[PDB]
Amino acid sequence: GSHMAQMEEERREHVAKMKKMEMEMEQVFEMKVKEKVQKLKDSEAELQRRHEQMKKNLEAQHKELEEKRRQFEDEKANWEAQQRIL
Amino acid sequence: GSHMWQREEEELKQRFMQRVKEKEATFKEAEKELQDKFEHLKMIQQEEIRKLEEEKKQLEGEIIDFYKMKAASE
Ligand code: NA
Ligand code: NA
Ligand code: NA
Ligand code: NA
Numbered sequence: 652g653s654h655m656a657q658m659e660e661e662r663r664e665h666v667a668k669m670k671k672m673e674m675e676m677e678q679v680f681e682m683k684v685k686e687k688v689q690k691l692k693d694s695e696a697e698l699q700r701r702h703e704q705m706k707k708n709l710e711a712q713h714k715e716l717e718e719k720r721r722q723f724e725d726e727k728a729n730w731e732a733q734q735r736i737l
Numbered sequence: 738g739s740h741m742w743q744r745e746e747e748e749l750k751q752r753f754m755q756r757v758k759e760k761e762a763t764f765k766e767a768e769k770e771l772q773d774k775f776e777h778l779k780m781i782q783q784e785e786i787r788k789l790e791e792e793k794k795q796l797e798g799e800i801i802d803f804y805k806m807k808a809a810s811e
Binding site: 658661662665668669672673676680683684687690691694695698699701702705706709712713716719720723726727730734 | 738739742745746749753756757760761764767768771772775778779782785786789792793796799800803807810
């Protein structure tokens with residue numbers, strides 16, 4: 652009767668509601684995964700930037716030491732050759 | 738009826754809640770692995786820094802001995 656027809660219209664509205672809800676929730680979830688993927692890419696990029704900076708800093712530190720040692724050995728060998736009395 | 742329809746809404750809302758939660762647990766683990774890999778590489782470079790400092794200090798001591806010998810030689 653009139654209550655069955657009212658409930659049938661409510662049932663129809665519910666079916667349409669679940670369709671829209673699922674579709675829209677899927678769109679929100681996709682944008683959520685898209686944000687998490689970008690956050691993870693940023694994290695790796697920052698850590699690789701820090702690693703490259705420290706790597707280049709260590710190369711400079713090694714080079715400066717190698718230079719000072721090379722000049723010290725050259726000056727010591729020059730001195731030795733100059734101290735030969737005979 | 739009306740209560741079953743409300744329950745259907747809640748089941749879908751609970752589904753997405755759990756789906757987002759499991760997705761978040763995978764991202765948290767990928768970030769964890771990422772942090773461990775780069776922490777490992779950082780430790781190695783911090784030991785390189787201390788070895789370089791130690792080498793610099795050793796070369797400075799050799800230079801002192803050499804200069805003191807040059808002054809004491811002539
Ligand atoms: Na973002
Ligand atoms: Na001579
Ligand atoms: Na699902
Ligand atoms: Na260090």
